[PDB]
Symmetry: C3
Subunit: 323 residues, 3 copies
Amino acid sequence: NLYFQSVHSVAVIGAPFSQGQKRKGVEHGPAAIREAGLMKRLSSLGCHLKDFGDLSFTPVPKDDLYNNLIVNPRSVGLANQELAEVVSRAVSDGYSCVTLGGDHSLAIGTISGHARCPDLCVVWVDAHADINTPLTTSSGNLHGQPVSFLLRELQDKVPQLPGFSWIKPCISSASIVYIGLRDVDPPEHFILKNYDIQYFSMRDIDRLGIQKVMERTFDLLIGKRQRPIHLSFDIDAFDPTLAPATGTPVVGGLTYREGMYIAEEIHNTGLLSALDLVEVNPQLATSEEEAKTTANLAVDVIASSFGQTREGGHIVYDQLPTP
Amino acid sequence: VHSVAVIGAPFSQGQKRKGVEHGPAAIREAGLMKRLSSLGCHLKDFGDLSFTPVPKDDLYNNLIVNPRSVGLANQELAEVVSRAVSDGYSCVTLGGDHSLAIGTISGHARHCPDLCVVWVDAHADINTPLTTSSGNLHGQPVSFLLRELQDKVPQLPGFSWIKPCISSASIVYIGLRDVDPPEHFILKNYDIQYFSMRDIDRLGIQKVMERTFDLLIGKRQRPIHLSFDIDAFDPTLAPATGTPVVGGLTYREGMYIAEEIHNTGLLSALDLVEVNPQLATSEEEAKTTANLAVDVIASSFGQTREGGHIVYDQLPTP
Amino acid sequence: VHSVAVIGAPFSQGQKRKGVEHGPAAIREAGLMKRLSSLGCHLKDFGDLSFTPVPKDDLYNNLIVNPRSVGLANQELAEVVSRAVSDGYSCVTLGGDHSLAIGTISGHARHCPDLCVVWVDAHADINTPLTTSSGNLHGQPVSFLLRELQDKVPQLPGFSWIKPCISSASIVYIGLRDVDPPEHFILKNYDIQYFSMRDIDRLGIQKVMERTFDLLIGKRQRPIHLSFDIDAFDPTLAPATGTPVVGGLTYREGMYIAEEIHNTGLLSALDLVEVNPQLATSEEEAKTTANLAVDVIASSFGQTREGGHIVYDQLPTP
Ligand SMILES: NC[C@H](CCC[B-](O)(O)O)[C@H](N)C(=O)O
Ligand SMILES: [Mn+2]
Ligand SMILES: [Mn+2]
Ligand SMILES: [Mn+2]
Ligand SMILES: [Mn+2]
Ligand SMILES: [Mn+2]
Ligand SMILES: [Mn+2]
């Protein structure tokens, strides 16, 4: 194959995080996405691949939990400062940065690195809003807290944490739109409602349909002017039947077809500047088929974000072979 | 804050498949009361009723299965429902087969003259004791309750206490997909409005609820009796049911129904029936059906996807 | 009353995967006849056609597997289909792989030259013998039957009898999600209209059927040939198939197609293909795929979710 509808410059990062939460086995995530055949698929889409590989992470020996709840603040904060540089390296070069997880904590870095493109906009695709402040959280796991640090208006409600001094608020209220919300905690709900954070919960997808959801997502974000899109995609935004290998599985999720639609609609704006793919936990499966379904689903999302569709036509066919 | 009464009705005589009596227990074991408390509901556990059995009650006119048992059990239940509604509680009834709606709707009618029904099921349950092919009374409750059908319903043993209390314009169905030919005649002929799986596929559950509430409470506010059969949902979601019919409601559709019922602020009585744990192939499949039932009752009393039930007022500053 | 002809076509040579030849028997064990009977249909069962085996059958241009065996069996089937259409029967063909659609559409077009096709499949099966990557004829049937592709289609051993019977404006695809780059080229350059899963996600199955019928029967009523591949549905619903592809039609959507095909009253021939009971992990996986196929044919001939197929005009009185 030598002809394609569009050629994309794709930078792939493997971030094996496991300290952002407490459930072990989410570190094997970027490795399972590769075993499924991610790079082979991106190559068949006519992409200029620039693999940064699986990054090695070292935990800080003396790392006390802040305010006796926030587990591993130094180990996550430092790892995110460095991942932000790898993302800023690729984006400045002209590459679209794909980050394989791991847990949703790595989103602090990817979005901050992307920002270094100031007029960016995020599309959060999760079952959870991940907008908990270090005070309002109940679990202590930082994977449910990344959006708080990135928002400009939440600066006064978020305290200075150890190894979090490097973060500067980059994205405003109108610059983030959520999709697939079904497990929102009481303080998380207050933040969205009061700070005018426009969102599309599972209920809003039921009422309007994935087509209207995406249309409205782009009318709010890239409506005023053309803006680079950051797509933070969490595997648990899909129904547990489709994505059983995840730490926080919430029933009544997005269908395979809904996720693919989201991914395709992102690809059709031609503004996807970075993508996150998180919560793939191969240790959270009851069978090999369940482990492989989640991995293939993850690949499908990334591929659909860079051309892959149901109609096909990503690969351009020259002429019909005459007999 | 809503005053909610919970009644468990371990009754199986409305059909032949054994195990539906263990339904109220399995919904309770799925933490029903605990979930209802966590939403801020003033609870009143009425317990798991022990019905008076009939020793001599067999096949009537070589068709109707166990009528004296069905009628008496429904009579006793209508008194308990009557007690619950009269005090000021929103009556939750756990089944058990759908023949129990004779009791719950009759008892609710004793205090609510202008009551309207939302019947969420795969079936119409409107067969008369004359149109039924099975003889199973769980597929006949609406015939006894509907006024326009009075002249078409024969006097059954143990059914002499019932008096039709609902009109054809006062009952809307959602999720029909296994309708008998006489049931289809009753629906069409008497103008009983319904939204079948097909109407859901066409219009969508948003328009379905918008249209349902226009039909029932469009002109005036009325107490809502929500009769929800667990078989309304697809057998992949609710496998522990007696009559599984493929092509059912998705989890998202069921919650949306329950959410929009709560959003009227007029829910007065709810039924959650046909949860049969003995019929699921595995223990986890029995738990899936039970937890799904709990989610319906919960969504009907405030639980949502947006997470706006537990009220938050102030954010802590550093 | 519909006169329905049921033809067992145990085709296997169209693909390399073994077991799809047991598909017609699998659909019958799932009570296809009993279901078509109680629908009020006039039945004729031709049994499973015993095709002439070709022992000396070598691969054409070292790629196309079993062309003589496929070509001959399809010519044998085209005669049986032709015979049934002549007797005023709606020709139902139980497969077998989708290569048998060559014989079914061919035999149908002899008596119905103004027929229009509704292709409900995950794939387009429009690969020419010069574009195919697998050399499997089951993914090549439309190529031989398309009029505008004649100059691009070479003459295969035992494929002469085939005269391109349908034009590009007469075939409409529904359920597309695994389209090959040469297949995609044909569909865009020859102007073949289709509705992929993305088109269904955007418009909804109601608008799909309305638009399908606008393209095919918008100017006049024509005989409808419904070529239904079981892999058009999601693999969770239809597990026992040779080429499963994720993100398929929901059970509700597949029945909607069928119910709409019936509402026109124009269905002249129907193929139900790719039901492979060997490729199922468990006994219930095969039976689920078979029963699903039985729901498809039955829905295409009257079976509804509302129940209005059997006539009911008067209620029994006590
Ligand atoms: N990936 C297999 C495809 C064939 C499916 C045919 B079927 O199952 O739809 O009949 C493919 N396009 C091919 O040419 O071999
Ligand atoms: Mn997350
Ligand atoms: Mn999540
Ligand atoms: Mn019922
Ligand atoms: Mn039912
Ligand atoms: Mn096919
Ligand atoms: Mn196919």
